[PDB]
Design an enzyme around this catalytic site. Structure first.
Site, PDB file in Angstrom:
ATOM      1  N   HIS A  62     -55.868 -43.840 -95.623  1.00 20.00           N
ATOM      2  CA  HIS A  62     -54.750 -43.092 -96.199  1.00 20.00           C
ATOM      3  C   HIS A  62     -54.921 -41.592 -95.976  1.00 20.00           C
ATOM      4  O   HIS A  62     -54.013 -40.906 -95.477  1.00 20.00           O
ATOM      5  CB  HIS A  62     -54.659 -43.414 -97.697  1.00 20.00           C
ATOM      6  CG  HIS A  62     -53.548 -42.712 -98.416  1.00 20.00           C
ATOM      7  ND1 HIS A  62     -52.419 -43.367 -98.860  1.00 20.00           N
ATOM      8  CD2 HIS A  62     -53.404 -41.419 -98.793  1.00 20.00           C
ATOM      9  CE1 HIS A  62     -51.622 -42.505 -99.466  1.00 20.00           C
ATOM     10  NE2 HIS A  62     -52.196 -41.316 -99.439  1.00 20.00           N
ATOM     11  N   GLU A  63     -56.091 -41.067 -96.335  1.00 16.70           N
ATOM     12  CA  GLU A  63     -56.328 -39.637 -96.202  1.00 16.70           C
ATOM     13  C   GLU A  63     -56.287 -39.203 -94.740  1.00 16.70           C
ATOM     14  O   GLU A  63     -55.790 -38.115 -94.424  1.00 16.70           O
ATOM     15  CB  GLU A  63     -57.664 -39.274 -96.850  1.00 16.70           C
ATOM     16  CG  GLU A  63     -57.750 -39.614 -98.342  1.00 16.70           C
ATOM     17  CD  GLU A  63     -56.574 -39.083 -99.142  1.00 16.70           C
ATOM     18  OE1 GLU A  63     -56.205 -37.906 -98.954  1.00 16.70           O
ATOM     19  OE2 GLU A  63     -56.015 -39.846 -99.957  1.00 16.70           O
TER      20      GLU A  63
ATOM     21  N   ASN B 287     -57.028 -32.624 -97.981  1.00 20.27           N
ATOM     22  CA  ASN B 287     -57.156 -31.237 -97.534  1.00 20.27           C
ATOM     23  C   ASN B 287     -57.607 -31.172 -96.079  1.00 20.27           C
ATOM     24  O   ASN B 287     -58.543 -31.867 -95.675  1.00 20.27           O
ATOM     25  CB  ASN B 287     -58.140 -30.457 -98.413  1.00 20.27           C
ATOM     26  CG  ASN B 287     -58.001 -30.778 -99.884  1.00 20.27           C
ATOM     27  OD1 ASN B 287     -57.025 -30.386-100.529  1.00 20.27           O
ATOM     28  ND2 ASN B 287     -58.986 -31.480-100.430  1.00 20.27           N
TER      29      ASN B 287
ATOM     30  N   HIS C 223     -52.764 -38.926 -93.565  1.00 22.69           N
ATOM     31  CA  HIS C 223     -52.140 -37.675 -93.987  1.00 22.69           C
ATOM     32  C   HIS C 223     -52.391 -36.529 -93.016  1.00 22.69           C
ATOM     33  O   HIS C 223     -51.620 -35.564 -93.015  1.00 22.69           O
ATOM     34  CB  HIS C 223     -52.632 -37.267 -95.376  1.00 22.69           C
ATOM     35  CG  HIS C 223     -51.901 -37.929 -96.499  1.00 22.69           C
ATOM     36  ND1 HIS C 223     -50.529 -37.876 -96.621  1.00 22.69           N
ATOM     37  CD2 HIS C 223     -52.347 -38.643 -97.558  1.00 22.69           C
ATOM     38  CE1 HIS C 223     -50.161 -38.527 -97.709  1.00 22.69           C
ATOM     39  NE2 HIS C 223     -51.245 -39.006 -98.294  1.00 22.69           N
TER      40      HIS C 223
ATOM     41  N   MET D 164     -57.848 -36.420-101.879  1.00 21.56           N
ATOM     42  CA  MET D 164     -56.871 -35.398-101.523  1.00 21.56           C
ATOM     43  C   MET D 164     -57.098 -34.985-100.075  1.00 21.56           C
ATOM     44  O   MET D 164     -58.229 -34.693 -99.679  1.00 21.56           O
ATOM     45  CB  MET D 164     -56.951 -34.186-102.456  1.00 21.56           C
ATOM     46  CG  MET D 164     -56.004 -33.073-102.049  1.00 21.56           C
ATOM     47  SD  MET D 164     -54.289 -33.622-102.157  1.00 21.56           S
ATOM     48  CE  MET D 164     -53.556 -32.673-100.831  1.00 21.56           C
TER      49      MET D 164
HETATM   50 ZN   LIG Z   1     -51.630 -39.444-100.449  1.00 24.23          ZN
END
Ligand SMILES: [Zn+2]
Ligand SMILES: *[C@@H]1O[C@H](CO)[C@@H](O[C@@H]2O[C@H](CO)[C@@H](O)[C@H](O)[C@H]2NC(C)=O)[C@H](O)[C@H]1NC(C)=O
Ligand SMILES: *[C@@H]1O[C@H](CO)[C@@H](O[C@@H]2O[C@H](CO)[C@@H](O)[C@H](O)[C@H]2NC(C)=O)[C@H](O)[C@H]1NC(C)=O
Ligand SMILES: *[C@@H]1O[C@H](CO)[C@@H](O)[C@H](O)[C@H]1NC(C)=O
Ligand SMILES: *[C@@H]1O[C@H](CO)[C@@H](O)[C@H](O)[C@H]1NC(C)=O
Ligand SMILES: *[C@@H]1O[C@H](CO)[C@@H](O)[C@H](O)[C@H]1NC(C)=O
Ligand SMILES: *[C@@H]1O[C@H](CO)[C@@H](O)[C@H](O)[C@H]1NC(C)=O
Ligand SMILES: *[C@@H]1O[C@H](CO)[C@@H](O)[C@H](O)[C@H]1NC(C)=O
Ligand SMILES: *[C@@H]1O[C@H](CO)[C@@H](O)[C@H](O)[C@H]1NC(C)=O
EC number: 3.4.11.2
Lengths: 892, 78
Positions: free
Chosen positions: A321-322, A289, A325, A287
Site C-alpha cells: 500500500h505505502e 512519506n 502511494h 504513512m
Molecule cells: Zn494510504
C-alpha cells in the site's frame, strides 16, 4: 468574511521552495516539556496584489526578528512593503502578516521565521516516540504530517496542491542519526556553537506536497539492500529488533514490490532510496512519506518464530500500500482532500497487485471481496454515507478532511477500481494509468483527468463499452451507494435500485443521476460463465437471465462488481439445492456472495430472514475459509443484536452444530494441533473453526485452549502455541480462567518484546468475564506508562466488544466525554449493539449534552450510529421471534 | 585466524561490511613454505581467485578473497 477567517488559503500567493532547519530537544526542560527549535525561509510568488501574507502555523511560538514575527525580503530586485503587524489566528491555524502595502503581481519574495514548538507525545506534527533499551529510556523525534500537521513543525502553505521543493537540515545529538526524505548531503558535521550536536543537511526534495515531509532523529539500526531498479531499500527499527532479524522480511519484499510497481506502471521510482522505518508510537498503520515511509512496528517488523501468518499478510499488504502511494499520491497528488480516494483507493487496490507479487501463492486478490467490498457496503448502504468524490466546497476544515479517511475512500475506492479493471481488463487499465502518471507527474489531479486517460486507453485497445468511461464511472464516483440488482428468472428481467439497509431511512443528498447506475453484469449458468452484459436502464430483459427446468443463474462472478444481487424465490431454492447437492459447483467467492447478499437483503426486508439463514445450512460441510468468514461476519450483526437476549443460547447451539465437524476435521488434519496447514486460506479456516467452536461452547475446544494456555503458563519461555492460534487461545483461556490467567497475560504483555504478541495479549485481556477485572483494565487503558496512547482506544474497543463490557464502557464514555475529547472508531464500536428505545434516547441525550463540545471526526459516525440504532430497533422487533424459532428448529 | 563482529550500537547497519576485522596470518611481517560465531544470518568463508587451488601473504605479490555473506544474499569482500 476576512481571508484569515476562511479555512482555504487564498490563491494570491504560491510557494516555490522552502528551507527548514529543525533541532529537537530529547530531554525535558524546566517545565518538563520536550521541545524543538527551528527556522525556515519560504520563497513564494505573488499571483495577485495583496497586503496580507496568510500561511499555516499550528502550536508554534515565534522568535522576533527585526521587530516582527517574520522577516520579509525581496527577490530579483523586488522591494517588499514594511510589515505592519502579525497575528496568530487559532481557529484557521494561520500566521497572518499584515503589510503596509501591496505585493506586486508576478514578483517573488522570501519570508524568514524562527520558531519553537512542543515535541509532544501526540503523534501529530513533529512529536516524540519512546521505548526502553534495557533500563535506558530512549526518546525518538519523528513526524506525522498527513493531513494538516506539517504546519505544526514549521510555517508552510499546507495544502496538497501548493507543491514546492524542500531543503531540510536537522540539528541533533552528535551520537544520533538524522533521516529525512532525501539522502544526506555530505557527512554530518559537529555544530560550531556546540560540538555536542551534529548538523545533517539533506539534498533538495522533488517538487512535492507538504503532507509527505518526514524528519526523524533516533539511534535506530537498519538493514539495507539495493533493489533491482537501483533504489536503495533500508529497514530501520530499534537496534534489538534489527539484530533479532525482525526487519528481514520487509527487506525481502520491499524492493521487489517497488520494482514490480515501476515496471507494471511503466513509471520509475525517481528517488535514490526508499527508507522504511518502524516507530514505537504511531497513530495509523503507516504513512507514505516520500523517501521515508513510516510504519507501526506491527506493520513492518515480523518474527518467523512468533508472528502469525496474518501478521505476515498485514506486513506485505501495508508495504505494498505505502509503495503504491509513491505513484498514486506522491508523484501524482489529489488537487484537494475531497478527492482523497484518488490516493487511497488506488493504494488500497494496488497493494494487492504488489502483495500478490511478493506472495503469489496466497491468492490475496480474492480477499478483496471480504476485506474491501463487503467491508464498505455496510456503511455505504446508509443514507449518511458520502460519495467517492465529495464536492470540493463541502470539505474545508481539518475535521472534515480527517473524516474522509474512512471506508468509502479506501475500500469503496478499491472496489470500484477492481470493477473497472475487471470490465476493462487489468492490462488496459494499467496502460491508462501509466499515461495518467506520465502526464501528471509532479502535478495534481481531479477524477476527470483519470477518466480522460482511461478513455484514451480504451480507444487505443478498441474496447467497446455502452458509453464513455466518464459516463460509466461518474455513476460510481459522484453519487453515494450502490445498486441491488433483482433478477426475475421466470422472464429474464433485471432491475436495479439504490440498496438501503433501512427502507425507512431519509436520503437527503440529491444525485443528478437519480441513484441509477450503469452496471457491468457478469453471470454464470449452472457453473458455466455466460456472455457479459451491460445494464444501462432501471430495468431490462435478456435471455441470459431467463431459466427453465433445473437451470439456475448467478450474477457477479467472483464479485468483481460493486453491487448486490437478489433473485426470485424459485432461483434461490435452486441455489440452495445446488449447495446441498454439490457446493463446489458454485465458485467459493459466489458462495460468500450468496451468504452476505442474502443476509443484507434480509436486513432490508427484501428477502425473508429464513432464506439467509437457510443459506448457512451447507456450512456444516464447508471447509473453505471465505464462505465461513462471510457467514461469521454476517452473523456478527445477529450476535450484537441478540447476545443479551434469549436468542443467544439457541444461536450458539446452532453454530456449535454447524462447526463441530469442521473442528474435528482440523483436529485430525493438524495432528492434534501440532502443525498448521500449508495453504494460507486453510490456516485462516482453521483459526476460524477454533474461534467458532470455543465461542459457541464446543467442550473439546474449551479443553484444548485451556490446556494449551496452562502449558504455556508452566513453560512461559517456551510458548507451545503456534502464532496463528495465539489470539484465540489467549482470549478463550482468559475467558475460561480467572485472576491468575489474567495476571499472567498482563505480565507477558508488560515484558513483551514483539509488538504482534503484545497486540494479541492486549486484545485477549478484554475477554475476562469478571466485571471487576474489566474495570481495572479500563483504568489501565488511560495510563500511557501502562498502555501506549496509540493503543488506548483500540483496547477500550476490545472491552466494549465484550458483552459484559458494553455497559461499563458506554457509561465510561458518558461520564468522561469532555476529558476524552479535549485529551470516531470508538463511537461506532460502542454503539453497534444498540437495539432498544432506551439506548437510542441515551445516544440522543449524549448528543444534546455534547453538541457544543462537538464530535469532530466522529460527527458523521454519530449520525450513522443513530440511523443504525433506529434500524436495529425495528429489525429486532420484526425478527427476534422468527430467528429464535429458526435456530431452535435448526440447532437439533 | 579470522574474527569479525557485525555493525550495531545505533545508527549502524547490521547487514553491511562488518565492523571489526582481524585477519592475522601468523608468522607474517611474506610467509613462504574461525572465531566469529553464528551472529545472526552472518557467515563467512574463503573463496578462490586467480590461483587454481583452494608463498602466502596478505600484501600484494607480483589471490584468494575472503568472503563474508549475510543470509547468502549480501556478500562483502575484505
Ligand atoms: Zn494510504
Ligand atoms: C533549495 O536548494 C536549491 C538548490 O541549491 C536552491 O536552488 C538554487 O537557487 C539559486 C538561487 O536562485 C540558483 O542560483 C540555483 O541555480 C538553484 N539551484 C538549483 C539546483 O535549482 C533553492 O533556491 C533552495 N531553496 C531555498 C528556499 O533556499
Ligand atoms: C474466479 O475465481 C476463481 C477462484 O479464485 C478462479 O479459479 C481459479 O483460477 C486460477 C487460474 O487458472 C486457478 O489456478 C485456480 O486453481 C482456480 N481456483 C479454483 C478453486 O479452481 C477463477 O479463475 C476466477 N474467474 C474469474 C473470471 O475471475
Ligand atoms: C509557547 O507559548 C505559550 C504561551 O506563552 C507557552 O504556554 C508554551 O509553553 C510555549 N511553547 C514552547 C514550546 O515554548
Ligand atoms: C557526528 O560528527 C562527528 C564528527 O567527526 C562524527 O565523529 C560522528 O560520527 C557524527 N555522528 C553521526 C551519528 O554521524
Ligand atoms: C527472500 O528470502 C528468501 C528466504 O526465505 C530467499 O529465498 C529469497 O531469495 C529472498 N528474496 C530475494 C528477492 O532475495
Ligand atoms: C427528512 O425528510 C423530510 C421529508 O421527507 C425532509 O423535510 C427533511 O429535510 C429530511 N431530513 C433532513 C435532515 O433533511
Ligand atoms: C428455507 O426457508 C423456508 C422459509 O422461508 C422454510 O420453509 C424452509 O424449511 C427452509 N429450508 C429448509 C431446508 O428447512
Ligand atoms: C586482533 O587485532 C589486533 C589489532 O587489531 C591484534 O593486536 C591482535 O593480535 C588480533 N588478534 C588475533 C587473535 O588475531
Amino acid at each position: 468574511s476576512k481571508a484569515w477567517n476562511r479555512y482555504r488559503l487564498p490563491n494570491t500567493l504560491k510557494p516555490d521552495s522552502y528551507r527548514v532547519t529543525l533541532r529537537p530537544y530529547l530531554t525535558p526542560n524546566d517545565r518538563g516539556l520536550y521541545v524543538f527549535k527551528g527556522s525556515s525561509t519560504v520563497r513564494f510568488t505573488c499571483k495577485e496584489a495583496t497586503d496580507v501574507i496568510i500561511i499555516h502555523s499550528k502550536k508554534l511560538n515565534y522568535t522576533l526578528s527585526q521587530g516582527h514575527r517574520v522577516v520579509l525580503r525581496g527577490v530579483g530586485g523586488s522591494q517588499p512593503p514594511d510589515i505592519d503587524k502579525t497575528e496568530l489566528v487559532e481557529p484557521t491555524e494561520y500566521l497572518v502578516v499584515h503589510l503596509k502595502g501591496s505585493l506586486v503581481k508576478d514578483s517573488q519574495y522570501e519570508m524568514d521565521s524562527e520558531f519553537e514548538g512542543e515535541l509532544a507525545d501526540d503523534l501529530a506534527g513533529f512529536y516524540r516516540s519512546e521505548y526502553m533499551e534495557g533500563n535506558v529510556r530512549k526518546v525518538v523525534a519523528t513526524t506525522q504530517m498527513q493531513a494538516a500537521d506539517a504546519r505544526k513543525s514549521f510555517p508552510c502553505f499546507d495544502e496538497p496542491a501548493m507543491k514546492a521543493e524542500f531543503n531540510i537540515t536537522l540539528i541533533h545529538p552528535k551520537d544520533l542519526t538524522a533521516l529525512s526524505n532525501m539522502l544526506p548531503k555530505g557527512p554530518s558535521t559537529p555544530l560550531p556553537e556546540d560540538p555536542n550536536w551534529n548538523v545533517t543537511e539533506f539534498h533538495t526534495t522533488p517538487k512535492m506536497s507538504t503532507y509527505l515531509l518526514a524528519f526523524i532523529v533516533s539511534e535506530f539500526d537498519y538493514v539495507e539492500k539495493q533493489a533491482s531498479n537501483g533504489v536503495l531499500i533500508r529497514i530501520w527499527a530499534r537496534p534489538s529488533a534489527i539484530a533479532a532479524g525482525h526487519g528481514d522480511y520487509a527487506l525481502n519484499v520491499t524492493g521487489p514490490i517497488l520494482n514490480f510497481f515501476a515496471g507494471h506502471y511503466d513509471t520509475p521510482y525517481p528517488l535514490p532510496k526508499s527508507d522504511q522505518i518502524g516507530l514505537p508510537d504511531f497513530n495509523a498503520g503507516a504513512m507514505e512519506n516520500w523517501g521515508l515511509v513510516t510504519y507501526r512496528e506491527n506493520s513492518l517488523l515480523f518474527d518467523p518464530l512468533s508472528s502469525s501468518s496474518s501478521n505476515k499478510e498485514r506486513v506485505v499488504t501495508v508495504i505494498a500500500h505505502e509503495l503504491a502511494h509513491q505513484w498514486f499520491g506522491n508523484l501524482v497528488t489529489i488537487e484537494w482532500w475531497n478527492d482523497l480516494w484518488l490516493n487511497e483507493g488506488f493504494a488500497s487496490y494496488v497493494e494487492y497487485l504488489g502483495a500478490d507479487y511478493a506472495e503469489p501463492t496466497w491468492n490475496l486478490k480474492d480477499l478483496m471481496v471480504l476485506n474491501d467490498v463487503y467491508r464498505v457496503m455496510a456503511v455505504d448502504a446508509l443514507a449518511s454515507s458520502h460519495p467517492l468524490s465529495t464536492p470540493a466546497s463541502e470539505i474545508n476544515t481539518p475535521a472534515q478532511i480527517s473524516e474522509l479517511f474512512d471506508a468509502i475512500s479506501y475500500s469503496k475506492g478499491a472496489s470500484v477500481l477492481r470493477m473497472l479493471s475487471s470490465f476493462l481488463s487489468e492490462d488496459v487499465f494499467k496502460q491508462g494509468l501509466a499515461s495518467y502518471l506520465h502526464t501528471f507527474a509532479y502535478q495534481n489531479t481531479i477524477y476527470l483527468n483519470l477518466w480522460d486517460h482511461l478513455q484514451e486507453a480504451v480507444n487505443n485497445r478498441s474496447i467497446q463499452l455502452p458509453t464513455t468511461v466518464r459516463d460509466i464511472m461518474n455513476r460510481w464516483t459522484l453519487q453515494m451507494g450502490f445498486p441491488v440488482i433483482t433478477v426475475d428468472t421466470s422472464t429474464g428481467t433485471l432491475s436495479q435500485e439504490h440498496f438501503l439497509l433501512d427502507p425507512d431511512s431519509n436520503v437527503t443528498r440529491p444525485s443528478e443521476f437519480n441513484y441509477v447506475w450503469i452496471v457491468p453484469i457478469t453471470s454464470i449458468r449452472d457453473g458455466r460463465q455466460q456472455q457479459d452484459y451491460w445494464l444501462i436502464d432501471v430495468r431490462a430483459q435478456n435471455d441470459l437471465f431467463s431459466t427453465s427446468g433445473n437451470e439456475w443463474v448467478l450474477l457477479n462472478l467472483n464479485v468483481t462488481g460493486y453491487y448486490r444481487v437478489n433473485y426470485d424465490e424459485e432461483n434461490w431454492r435452486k441455489i440452495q439445492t445446488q449447495l446441498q447437492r454439490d457446493h463446489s459447483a458454485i465458485p467459493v467467492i459466489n458462495r460468500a456472495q450468496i451468504i452476505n447478499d442474502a443476509f443484507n437483503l434480509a436486513s432490508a426486508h427484501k428477502v425473508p430472514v429464513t432464506l439467509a439463514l437457510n443459506n448457512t445450512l451447507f456450512l456444516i460441510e464447508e471447509r473453505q475459509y471465505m464462505p465461513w468468514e462471510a457467514a461469521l461476519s454476517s452473523l456478527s450483526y445477529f450476535k450484537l443484536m441478540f447476545d443479551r437476549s434469549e436468542v443467544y443460547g439457541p444461536m450458539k447451539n446452532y453454530l456449535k452444530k454447524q462447526v463441530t465437524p469442521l473442528f474435528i476435521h482440523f483436529r485430525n488434519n493438524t495432528n492434534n494441533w501440532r502443525e498448521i496447514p500449508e495453504n494460507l486460506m486453510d490456516q485462516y479456516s482453521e483459526v476460524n473453526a477454533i474461534s467458532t467452536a470455543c465461542s459457541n461452547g464446543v467442550p473439546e475446544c474449551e479443553e484444548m485452549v485451556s490446556g494449551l494456555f496452562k502449558q504455556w503458563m508452566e513453560n512461559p519461555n517456551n510458548n507451545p502455541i503456534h502464532p496463528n492460534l495465539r489470539s484465540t487461545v489467549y482470549c478463550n483461556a482468559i475467558a475460561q480462567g480467572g485472576e491468575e490467567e489474567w495476571d499472567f497475560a498482563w505480565e507477558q504483555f508488560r515484558n513483551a518484546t514483539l509488538v504482534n504478541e503484545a497486540d494479541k495479549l492486549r486484545a485477549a485481556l478484554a475477554c475476562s468475564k469478571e466485571l471487576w477485572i474489566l474495570n481495572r483494565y479500563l483504568s489501565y487503558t488511560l495510563n500511557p506508562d501502562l498502555i501506549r496512547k496509540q493503543d488506548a482506544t483500540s483496547t477500550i474497543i476490545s472491552i466494549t466488544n465484550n458483552v459484559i463490557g458494553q455497559g461499563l464502557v458506554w457509561d465510561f464514555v458518558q461520564s468522561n466525554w469532555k476529558k476524552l475529547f479535549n485529551d470516531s472508531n470508538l463511537i461506532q464500536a460502542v454503539t453497534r449493539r444498540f437495539s432498544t428505545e432506551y439506548e437510542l434516547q441515551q445516544l440522543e441525550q449524549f448528543k444534546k449534552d455534547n453538541e457544543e463540545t462537538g464530535f469532530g471526526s466522529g460527527t458523521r459516525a454519530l449520525e450513522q450510529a443513530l440511523e443504525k440504532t433506529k434500524a436495529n430497533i425495528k429489525w429486532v422487533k420484526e425478527n427476534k421471534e422468527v430467528v429464535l424459532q429458526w435456530f431452535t428448529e435448526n440447532s437439533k | 585466524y579470522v574474527d569479525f563482529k557485525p555493525q550495531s550500537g545505533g545508527g549502524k547497519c547490521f547487514n553491511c561490511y562488518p565492523a571489526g576485522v582481524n585477519i592475522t596470518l601468523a608468522n607474517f611481517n611474506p610467509l613462504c613454505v574461525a572465531v566469529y560465531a553464528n551472529v545472526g544470518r552472518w557467515s563467512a568463508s574463503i573463496n578462490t581467485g586467480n590461483c587454481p587451488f583452494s608463498c602466502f601473504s596478505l600484501k600484494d605479490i607480483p589471490a584468494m578473497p575472503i568472503v563474508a555473506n549475510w543470509a547468502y544474499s549480501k556478500y562483502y569482500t575484505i
